[PDB]
Amino acid sequence: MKQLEDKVEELLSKVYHLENEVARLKKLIANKEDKADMKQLEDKVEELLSKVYHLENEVARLKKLVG
Amino acid sequence: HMKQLEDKVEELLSKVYHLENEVARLKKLIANKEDKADMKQLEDKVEELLSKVYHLENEVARLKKLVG
Amino acid sequence: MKQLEDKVEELLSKVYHLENEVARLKKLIANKEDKADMKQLEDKVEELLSKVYHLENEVARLKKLVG
């Protein structure tokens, strides 16, 4: 009967520790970069490349005309 | 008292089940995280953009002065 | 006693396996990019997007004026 009580006690402690380890693991995971975030960043750079290209072309035409 | 212990194991049964589900959820989240990589390619593109934007700023300042 | 002891042993096996899974996930997590290490790239891109927005507006204004 002390045999069972001690097994249940081992289970209690190990469950409690696992709960804390999982809580820490989710905090760590939350601080990692999402694939979606990287994709957003790449698409913003693509947007910037395109806008800068158009601006260059626009500025070149303005420059000629102002002359 | 055996009932008290049964209730305790019932609690732990549920907690172990929840923990199994939390671990599977965390696996899925990890799969959607970006692997460490060399940032050279993205950084080089941003460096090109900052140079082009700097040069554009200078050009647009000149025109703004002339037109005004 | 026996039936409850067996249930407890079953749960100890599951907890044991879970501890190993968690150790393993910690290792996977180490191969992932830290969000904080992307902060500089992200901010630079946000700066550039604003600068390009303002440059576009100024160019369109000048163009209209000259045209």
Author numbering:
A (entry chain E), C (entry chain F): 1 to 67
B (entry chain D): 0 to 67
What do the paper's sentences say?
α-Helical coiled coils are ubiquitous protein domains, found in a wide range of structural and functional contexts. The structure of coiled coils is understood at a level unrivaled by any other fold. They consist of at least two α-helices, wound into superhelical bundles and held together by a mostly hydrophobic core. The seven positions in a heptad are labeled a – g, where positions a and d are oriented towards the core of the bundle and are thus mostly hydrophobic. We find that they indeed break the α-helices to form short β-strands, which associate into a triangular supersecondary structure we name the β-layer. β-Layers are found, also repetitively, in natural coiled coils, where they form regular fibers with alternating α- and β-structure, a protein fold that has not been described so far.
The observation that the T9 construct could accommodate the MATKDDIAN insert in two ways, forming the β-layer either at MAT or at KDD, led us to wonder whether the same could happen with the A9 insert, IENKADKAD, if the glutamate was interchanged with the central alanine to mirror the first six residues of the T9 insert (A9b, IANKEDKAD). We reasoned that the larger glutamate residue at the center of A9b might even be sufficiently unfavorable to move this construct quantitatively to the alternative structure, with the β-layer formed over the first three residues (IAN). A9b in fact crystallized in two alternative structures, but in both the β-layer formed over the central glutamate. Since this residue was indeed too large and polar to be accommodated without distortion, the first turns of the downstream helices are perturbed to different extents in both instances, leading to a pronounced kink in one of the structures (highlighted in pink in Figure 3A). We were surprised to see that the penalty introduced by the central glutamate was not sufficient to produce the alternative structure; the reasons for this are unclear to us at present. The Ramachandran plot in panel B includes all structures except the kinked grey A9b structure; all residues of the β-layers are shown as red dots and all other residues as black dots.
